[PDB]
């Protein structure tokens, strides 16, 4: 399925909000996000069907 996902963030250190769109064309995933778990202080992994989203900022992982 095509999917209009909604990325966003709100820093406490900056007290600031921002956001991004995240298209997902032809995804076979159907499930809602979660269970979630941060993969680091700067980065988080989250369940999305069998697949797992990985997101981060300032990360050395990238």
């Amino acid at each position: 399925e095509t999917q209009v996902w909604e990325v966003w963030m709100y820093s406490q250190s900056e007290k600031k909000h921002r956001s991004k769109s995240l298209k997902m064309y032809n995804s076979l995933i159907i499930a809602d996000p979660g269970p979630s778990l941060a993969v680091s202080d700067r980065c988080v992994a989250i369940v999305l069907g069998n697949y797992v989203a990985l997101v981060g900022y300032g990360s050395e992982i990238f």
Binding site: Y10, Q12, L22, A31, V44, A45, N50, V52, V55
Partner: protein
């Protein structure tokens, strides 16, 4: 989350530049069930609905291990990992597996006690240590029965060795409990559905339970949930009347941060900048995940000031006056009495699934506003 091509709006800020998001192409045949993670962050492990096992490295981005369902037993009630992340444990209802990943070999297999179908909970505990040259572990096995198993498990590269040690049998069915290892000593928290909060603690050979004092003012409350910071060995404790932040070992209640009533199964805490100066364990900032009890909006209260505005004398390593002379850059920063901590509101829709960062510094999450077919 595969799609034929993911996309996001092109960034105009360095604030978003380092911000990034990537797939791991490797996958379960079918949707995820449950997972567990190493403290090192380098290691990761996962299981699907098909209960295939997968483990993966985070920084080196290279495959570590894969296991198909038919290699595995029909029942798989539980899962657990060592803090090093160098080894793996699995609980089929009748017998546990212990397998290395970095050096894939059958380190051990061992039958263990169970009382089906009461819900499992599990905790690893590192020994006197000597990795890699020699090792040991202390397998806690919490149960909804309120039984709490503990096992010896000395292990060496020669081949994992095993022996049972003790069977705790705590009163009443349990809401929650967690491991808490101070560098000085092992300790383990234990909430009851009764709301009792016992803690076993390892005085070496001694393994002493102790009755922590939830105090008289709100004893009757059904709890939401206790949560703490094991590296801080500090006990936060949910109540609608105000969370506890009780001390351990020498043990005392300190203070209760002012809060809105909060939904059960929600409470958790995170902190920036771990350090252990002068025996103290101060952190740069603190933050507070929980779903709201009523509005049910996601909520993450913040505390601390910073970047240079404040330093957190969380607890005191010794609740005594002290004059040890070593450099304390934090003294240049303003002292924090509880009064100025000043929570920072940011109520948000539940629909945006989201988590507080482990350091508590940053919010992250997503939701689908909409989706559509190939047509």
């Amino acid at each position: 989350g595969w799609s034929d091509h993911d996309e996001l709006s092109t960034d105009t800020t360095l604030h978003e530049e380092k911000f990034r998001i990537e797939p791991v192409p490797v996958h379960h045949q079918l949707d995820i069930l449950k997972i567990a993670v190493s403290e090192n962050y380098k290691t990761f492990a996962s299981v699907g609905l098909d209960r295939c096992l997968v483990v993966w490295d985070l920084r080196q981005w290279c495959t570590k291990l894969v296991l198909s369902k038919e290699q595995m037993p029909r029942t798989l009630k539980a899962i657990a990992l060592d803090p090093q992340g160098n080894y793996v444990s699995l609980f089929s209802k009748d017998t546990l597996f212990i397998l290395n990943v970095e050096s894939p070999s059958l380190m051990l297999q061992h039958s263990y006690h169970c009382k089906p179908n009461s819900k499992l909970n599990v905790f690893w505990m590192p020994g006197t240590h000597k990795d890699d040259e020699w090792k040991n572990f202390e397998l806690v096995v919490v149960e909804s029965s309120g039984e709490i198993q503990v096992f010896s498990l000395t292990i060496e590269i020669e081949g994992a060795d095993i022996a049972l040690v003790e069977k705790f049998q705590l009163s009443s069915p349990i809401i929650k409990s967690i491991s808490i290892v101070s560098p000085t000593a092992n300790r383990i928290a234990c909430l009851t559905e009764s709301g009792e909060v016992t803690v076993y603690s390892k005085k070496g050979p001694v393994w002493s339970p102790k009755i922590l004092s939830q105090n008289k003012n709100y004893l009757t409350e059904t709890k939401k949930d206790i949560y703490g910071i094991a590296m801080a060995d500090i006990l936060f404790l949910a109540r609608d009347s105000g969370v506890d932040m009780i001390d351990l070992k020498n043990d005392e209640l300190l203070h209760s941060f002012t809060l809105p009533p909060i939904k059960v199964n929600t409470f958790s805490v995170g902190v920036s900048n771990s350090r252990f100066v002068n025996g103290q364990f101060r952190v740069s900032s603190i933050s507070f995940c929980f779903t709201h009890a009523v509005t049910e909006k996601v909520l993450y209260y913040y505390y601390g000031n910073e970047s240079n505005e404040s330093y957190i004398i969380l607890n005191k390593w010794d609740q005594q006056p002290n004059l040890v002379d070593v450099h304390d850059p934090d003294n240049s920063l303003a002292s924090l009495t509880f009064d100025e901590l000043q929570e920072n509101i940011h109520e948000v829709e539940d629909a945006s699934e989201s988590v507080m960062s482990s350091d508590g510094l940053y919010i992250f999450g997503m939701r689908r506003k909409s989706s559509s077919g190939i047509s």
